[PDB]
Design an enzyme around this catalytic site. Structure first.
Site, mmCIF file in Angstrom:
data_model
loop_
_atom_site.group_PDB
_atom_site.id
_atom_site.type_symbol
_atom_site.label_atom_id
_atom_site.label_comp_id
_atom_site.label_asym_id
_atom_site.label_seq_id
_atom_site.Cartn_x
_atom_site.Cartn_y
_atom_site.Cartn_z
ATOM 1 N N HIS A 84 76.022 39.292 -26.181
ATOM 2 C CA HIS A 84 76.722 38.996 -24.891
ATOM 3 C C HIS A 84 77.031 40.194 -24.059
ATOM 4 O O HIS A 84 78.209 40.434 -23.698
ATOM 5 C CB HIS A 84 77.973 38.151 -25.112
ATOM 6 C CG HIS A 84 77.662 36.770 -25.537
ATOM 7 N ND1 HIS A 84 77.737 36.375 -26.851
ATOM 8 C CD2 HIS A 84 77.219 35.687 -24.826
ATOM 9 C CE1 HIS A 84 77.353 35.099 -26.936
ATOM 10 N NE2 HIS A 84 77.024 34.667 -25.727
ATOM 11 N N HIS A 88 71.848 40.325 -21.471
ATOM 12 C CA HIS A 88 71.972 38.885 -21.386
ATOM 13 C C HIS A 88 72.171 38.405 -19.966
ATOM 14 O O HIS A 88 71.489 37.460 -19.583
ATOM 15 C CB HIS A 88 73.096 38.361 -22.294
ATOM 16 C CG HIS A 88 73.513 36.942 -22.025
ATOM 17 N ND1 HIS A 88 72.694 35.859 -22.274
ATOM 18 C CD2 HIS A 88 74.711 36.422 -21.632
ATOM 19 C CE1 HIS A 88 73.345 34.743 -22.012
ATOM 20 N NE2 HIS A 88 74.577 35.050 -21.622
ATOM 21 N N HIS A 124 79.062 36.010 -15.237
ATOM 22 C CA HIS A 124 79.437 34.825 -16.018
ATOM 23 C C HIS A 124 79.986 35.093 -17.430
ATOM 24 O O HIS A 124 80.610 34.215 -18.004
ATOM 25 C CB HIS A 124 78.317 33.741 -16.020
ATOM 26 C CG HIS A 124 77.335 33.874 -17.146
ATOM 27 N ND1 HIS A 124 76.220 34.681 -17.069
ATOM 28 C CD2 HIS A 124 77.345 33.340 -18.399
ATOM 29 C CE1 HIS A 124 75.580 34.614 -18.224
ATOM 30 N NE2 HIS A 124 76.254 33.829 -19.053
ATOM 31 N N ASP A 237 71.639 29.962 -19.095
ATOM 32 C CA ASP A 237 72.445 30.416 -20.235
ATOM 33 C C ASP A 237 71.841 30.121 -21.596
ATOM 34 O O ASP A 237 71.937 30.965 -22.498
ATOM 35 C CB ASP A 237 73.880 29.861 -20.174
ATOM 36 C CG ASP A 237 74.927 30.806 -20.856
ATOM 37 O OD1 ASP A 237 74.651 32.027 -20.977
ATOM 38 O OD2 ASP A 237 75.997 30.301 -21.287
HETATM 39 C C1 LIG Z 1 68.849 31.434 -29.208
HETATM 40 O O1 LIG Z 1 69.715 30.782 -30.140
HETATM 41 C C2 LIG Z 1 70.954 30.377 -29.713
HETATM 42 C C3 LIG Z 1 71.422 30.540 -28.417
HETATM 43 C C4 LIG Z 1 72.693 30.128 -28.072
HETATM 44 C C5 LIG Z 1 73.530 29.527 -29.008
HETATM 45 C C6 LIG Z 1 74.892 29.062 -28.614
HETATM 46 N N1 LIG Z 1 75.452 28.171 -29.359
HETATM 47 N N2 LIG Z 1 76.732 27.768 -29.054
HETATM 48 C C7 LIG Z 1 77.191 26.587 -29.828
HETATM 49 C C8 LIG Z 1 77.243 26.969 -31.308
HETATM 50 C C9 LIG Z 1 78.095 26.085 -32.211
HETATM 51 C C10 LIG Z 1 77.492 24.725 -32.341
HETATM 52 C C11 LIG Z 1 77.714 23.861 -31.144
HETATM 53 C C12 LIG Z 1 76.715 24.015 -30.032
HETATM 54 C C13 LIG Z 1 76.317 25.402 -29.522
HETATM 55 C C14 LIG Z 1 77.592 28.462 -28.205
HETATM 56 O O2 LIG Z 1 78.714 28.053 -27.952
HETATM 57 C C15 LIG Z 1 77.090 29.765 -27.638
HETATM 58 C C16 LIG Z 1 77.885 30.254 -26.409
HETATM 59 C C17 LIG Z 1 77.436 29.620 -25.131
HETATM 60 C C18 LIG Z 1 76.307 28.937 -25.000
HETATM 61 C C19 LIG Z 1 75.338 28.701 -26.115
HETATM 62 C C20 LIG Z 1 75.574 29.615 -27.354
HETATM 63 C C21 LIG Z 1 73.069 29.355 -30.323
HETATM 64 C C22 LIG Z 1 71.787 29.774 -30.686
HETATM 65 C C23 LIG Z 1 71.346 29.632 -32.048
HETATM 66 C C24 LIG Z 1 71.057 29.574 -33.204
HETATM 67 C C25 LIG Z 1 70.749 29.632 -34.595
HETATM 68 N N3 LIG Z 1 71.678 29.219 -35.499
HETATM 69 O O3 LIG Z 1 69.621 30.031 -34.871
HETATM 70 MG MG LIG Z 2 79.754 32.476 -21.867
HETATM 71 ZN ZN LIG Z 3 76.153 33.564 -21.269
#
Ligand SMILES: COc1ccc(C2=NN(C3CCCCCC3)C(=O)[C@@H]3CC=CC[C@H]23)cc1C#CC(N)=O
Ligand SMILES: [Mg+2]
Ligand SMILES: [Zn+2]
Length: 333
Positions: A84, A88, A124, A237
């Site tokens: 982050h 990003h 953001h 995002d």
């Molecule tokens: C490129 O991969 C990824 C990219 C982003 C995220 C994100 N997940 N969540 C949440 C995680 C908890 C579960 C509920 C749903 C999603 C976030 O709140 C993050 C903060 C804001 C937006 C999305 C972000 C996860 C992965 C992965 C994976 C992997 N376990 O490989």
């Molecule tokens: Mg954010």
């Molecule tokens: Zn972001």
């Protein structure tokens, strides 16, 4: 905020990016970073050339020098964290530009809405510490305490908004200073509304409101514009899975590390950790990326495309293709 200096501006202006095209869906930020001594100057130069190349700041009274100062004030408020960070947000800005102008989503929005979206991408996640909203609330960290006493659980997203307002309060970095009256008010409201919509606790609500407003458009044109802005920031995002495989994979390594670090920190603090955040319970990246695609990203992009963003079809095709690649990794382990 302190003044941006002439030397800082010059170190960005000297960056040449011959052989990169910042408007292309195949643009590679990792390769741009690796090509120089000064990857933070290159990333600032990408955001600068992308915004000016659009025509939008010129249209809305933002001078070249106010635009650059704004970019460098954003840069100073991002931290040295694995995911982050300033890279990003420059990636999110570039990606939204592709959605507007190669996916033709600019047809659904005003020019002023498009300018606001690209600026909002850069603010953001300001001052993100690599820890999610649940960390603050479960550990009673001071920002968690303020959120609950205050009555808003989007601890991170409110903080990012506070710092955006701080940057834009200096006339030397106010990219909205050329707007008049009501337009200036629309801009601030839109920016804030979009940032608040990036909290994944609202993911389902945001998607339902968008699909409802798209089923008319006619009945409430303003609500459709507002929701389209929110849904496009959200799509930028979580766009890492729509990119060429090797780019996608580097993003996944970095996000995964921030998850693990949060988990180490909760354990230290006496809090019991969900296994996705636990170094001890995982081996390979593949299964995590397949899960993120199946349960979050593939349904999100296919639904927005089918409901009205038809020019964004390539996102779905590339998600499917990346997923098959991870699947091969698994079944030939
Ligand atoms: C490129 O991969 C990824 C990219 C982003 C995220 C994100 N997940 N969540 C949440 C995680 C908890 C579960 C509920 C749903 C999603 C976030 O709140 C993050 C903060 C804001 C937006 C999305 C972000 C996860 C992965 C992965 C994976 C992997 N376990 O490989
Ligand atoms: Mg954010
Ligand atoms: Zn972001």
């Amino acid at each position: 905020v302190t003044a941006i200096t002439k030397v800082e501006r010059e170190a960005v202006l000297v960056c040449e990016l011959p052989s990169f095209d910042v408007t292309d869906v195949e643009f590679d930020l990792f390769r741009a970073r690796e090509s120089t001594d000064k990857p933070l100057d290159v990333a600032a130069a990408i955001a600068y050339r992308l915004l000016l190349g659009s025509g939008l700041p010129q249209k809305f009274g933002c001078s070249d020098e106010v635009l650059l100062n704004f970019i460098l004030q954003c840069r100073k408020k991002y931290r040295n964290v694995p995911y982050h960070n300033f890279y990003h947000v420059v990636d999110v800005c570039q990606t939204i530009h592709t959605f507007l102008y190669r996916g033709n989503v600019y047809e659904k929005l005003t020019e002023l809405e498009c300018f606001v979206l690209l600026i909002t991408a850069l603010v953001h996640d300001l001052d993100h510490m690599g820890l999610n909203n649940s960390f603050y609330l479960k550990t009673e960290s001071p920002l968690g305490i303020l959120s609950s006493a205050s009555g808003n659980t989007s601890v991170l997203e409110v903080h990012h908004c506070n710092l955006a307002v701080e940057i834009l309060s200096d006339p030397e970095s106010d990219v909205f200073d050329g707007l008049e009256g009501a337009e200036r008010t629309l801009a601030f409201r839109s920016m804030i509304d979009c940032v608040l919509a990036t909290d994944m606790a609202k993911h389902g609500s945001a998607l339902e409101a968008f699909l409802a407003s798209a089923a008319d458009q006619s009945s409430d044109e303003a609500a459709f514009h507002r929701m389209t802005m929110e849904i496009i920031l959200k799509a930028g995002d979580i766009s890492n899975v729509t990119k060429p495989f090797d780019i996608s994979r580097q993003w996944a390594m970095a996000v995964t590390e921030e998850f693990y670090r949060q988990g180490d920190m909760e354990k230290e603090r006496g809090v019991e950790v969900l296994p996705m955040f636990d170094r001890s319970k995982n081996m390979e990246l593949a299964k995590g990326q397949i899960g993120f695609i199946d349960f979050v990203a593939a349904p999100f992009f296919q639904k927005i495309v089918d409901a009205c963003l038809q020019g964004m079809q390539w996102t779905v095709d590339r998600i499917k293709s990346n997923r098959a690649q991870w699947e091969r990794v698994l079944e030939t382990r």
